[PDB]
Design an enzyme around this catalytic site. Sequence first.
Site, PDB file in Angstrom:
ATOM      1  N   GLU A 209      13.583  39.958   0.308  1.00 38.58           N
ATOM      2  CA  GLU A 209      13.079  39.198  -0.847  1.00 38.58           C
ATOM      3  C   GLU A 209      14.020  39.386  -2.048  1.00 38.58           C
ATOM      4  O   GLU A 209      14.581  40.462  -2.257  1.00 38.58           O
ATOM      5  CB  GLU A 209      11.670  39.676  -1.182  1.00 38.58           C
ATOM      6  CG  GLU A 209      11.005  38.932  -2.318  1.00 38.58           C
ATOM      7  CD  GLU A 209      10.850  37.446  -2.104  1.00 38.58           C
ATOM      8  OE1 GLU A 209      11.716  36.720  -2.580  1.00 38.58           O
ATOM      9  OE2 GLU A 209       9.858  37.021  -1.478  1.00 38.58           O
TER      10      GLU A 209
ATOM     11  N   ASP B 276       9.739  40.144   3.423  1.00 38.78           N
ATOM     12  CA  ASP B 276      10.108  40.781   2.166  1.00 38.78           C
ATOM     13  C   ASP B 276      11.046  41.989   2.359  1.00 38.78           C
ATOM     14  O   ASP B 276      11.958  42.165   1.564  1.00 38.78           O
ATOM     15  CB  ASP B 276       8.843  41.222   1.448  1.00 38.78           C
ATOM     16  CG  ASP B 276       8.124  40.040   0.842  1.00 38.78           C
ATOM     17  OD1 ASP B 276       8.813  39.157   0.286  1.00 38.78           O
ATOM     18  OD2 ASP B 276       6.895  40.035   0.894  1.00 38.78           O
TER      19      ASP B 276
ATOM     20  N   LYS C 111      -2.240  35.745   4.871  1.00 40.68           N
ATOM     21  CA  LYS C 111      -0.890  36.124   5.296  1.00 40.68           C
ATOM     22  C   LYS C 111      -0.768  36.172   6.816  1.00 40.68           C
ATOM     23  O   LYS C 111       0.220  35.695   7.374  1.00 40.68           O
ATOM     24  CB  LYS C 111      -0.515  37.525   4.799  1.00 40.68           C
ATOM     25  CG  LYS C 111      -0.037  37.581   3.361  1.00 40.68           C
ATOM     26  CD  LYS C 111       1.220  36.805   3.115  1.00 40.68           C
ATOM     27  CE  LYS C 111       1.620  36.850   1.659  1.00 40.68           C
ATOM     28  NZ  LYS C 111       2.918  36.172   1.453  1.00 40.68           N
TER      29      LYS C 111
HETATM   30  C1  LIG Z   1       4.783  35.254  -5.420  1.00 36.90           C
HETATM   31  C2  LIG Z   1       4.461  33.910  -5.060  1.00 36.90           C
HETATM   32  C3  LIG Z   1       3.807  33.132  -6.006  1.00 36.90           C
HETATM   33  C4  LIG Z   1       3.460  31.792  -5.777  1.00 36.90           C
HETATM   34  C5  LIG Z   1       2.793  31.092  -6.743  1.00 36.90           C
HETATM   35  N1  LIG Z   1       2.734  29.760  -6.894  1.00 36.90           N
HETATM   36  O1  LIG Z   1       1.770  29.577  -8.170  1.00 36.90           O
HETATM   37  C6  LIG Z   1       1.416  30.799  -8.507  1.00 36.90           C
HETATM   38  O2  LIG Z   1       0.656  31.088  -9.450  1.00 36.90           O
HETATM   39  N2  LIG Z   1       1.992  31.692  -7.676  1.00 36.90           N
HETATM   40  C7  LIG Z   1       3.775  31.263  -4.517  1.00 36.90           C
HETATM   41  C8  LIG Z   1       4.424  32.047  -3.547  1.00 36.90           C
HETATM   42  C9  LIG Z   1       4.786  33.372  -3.809  1.00 36.90           C
HETATM   43  C10 LIG Z   1       5.361  34.196  -2.804  1.00 36.90           C
HETATM   44  C11 LIG Z   1       4.611  35.312  -2.410  1.00 36.90           C
HETATM   45  C12 LIG Z   1       5.025  36.211  -1.420  1.00 36.90           C
HETATM   46  O3  LIG Z   1       4.316  37.200  -1.157  1.00 36.90           O
HETATM   47  C13 LIG Z   1       6.236  35.946  -0.790  1.00 36.90           C
HETATM   48  O4  LIG Z   1       6.702  36.770   0.145  1.00 36.90           O
HETATM   49  C14 LIG Z   1       6.969  34.821  -1.113  1.00 36.90           C
HETATM   50  C15 LIG Z   1       8.152  34.462  -0.514  1.00 36.90           C
HETATM   51  O5  LIG Z   1       8.548  33.333  -0.793  1.00 36.90           O
HETATM   52  O6  LIG Z   1       8.749  35.148   0.353  1.00 36.90           O
HETATM   53  N3  LIG Z   1       6.530  33.953  -2.119  1.00 36.90           N
HETATM   54 MN   LIG Z   2       5.606  38.580  -0.045  1.00 33.74          MN
HETATM   55 MN   LIG Z   3       8.888  37.062   0.435  1.00 32.50          MN
END
Ligand SMILES: Cc1cc(-c2noc(=O)[nH]2)ccc1-c1cc(=O)c(O)c(C(=O)O)[nH]1
Ligand SMILES: [Mn+2]
Ligand SMILES: [Mn+2]
Length: 176
Positions: free
Chosen positions: A61, A89, A115
């Site tokens: 990540e 990640d 998840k």
């Molecule tokens: C942190 C996050 C926030 C959002 C998001 N979109 O509107 C929000 O308020 N949060 C969408 C995806 C992700 C996200 C979470 C993860 O746990 C993760 O591993 C990823 C990833 O892209 O690898 N992305």
């Molecule tokens: Mn994540």
């Molecule tokens: Mn991620």
Amino acid sequence: MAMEDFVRQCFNPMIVELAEKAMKEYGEDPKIETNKFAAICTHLEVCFMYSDFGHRFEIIEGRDRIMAWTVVNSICNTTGVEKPKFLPDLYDYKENRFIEIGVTRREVHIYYLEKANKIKEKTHIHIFSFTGEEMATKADYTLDEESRARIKTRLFTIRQEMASRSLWDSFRQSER
Ligand SMILES: Cc1cc(-c2noc(=O)[nH]2)ccc1-c1cc(=O)c(O)c(C(=O)O)[nH]1
Ligand SMILES: [Mn+2]
Ligand SMILES: [Mn+2]
């Protein structure tokens, strides 16, 4: 937006810049999607913190997609472990398995199912909340008590900081 100010003031510039990059490249404005910005930073910081409590972990990540996949492929070729469909990640060289890190404003069991359902892979899952709850697959929490406690404390501090600035109510209702 106080929320944009909060972000710039509570995360270190590398994280802010990494979060900004990942939003802006995909045409999302961090001055508009301020809750998303705050979430991306939060999650990045947790991933970095998790990595830092070990060279036990490979950070996937936070890298560009070319590098993340380069790192994943390189791990797969040398260990034999199945190649995940989605970028996780971290990789754990001790347990020889990828980790998906979750941070949730909701209940940890709820986010955990979200998840596990999404990567129905043999990736380890570790969910944190802003309340000090965690859930991990097979109740195997990977880290020692102290590293987990530092993550939980940081997350709770972000929440309380947001609450100081009246941003928390918005922030927690902006997750799925
Ligand atoms: C942190 C996050 C926030 C959002 C998001 N979109 O509107 C929000 O308020 N949060 C969408 C995806 C992700 C996200 C979470 C993860 O746990 C993760 O591993 C990823 C990833 O892209 O690898 N992305
Ligand atoms: Mn994540
Ligand atoms: Mn991620």
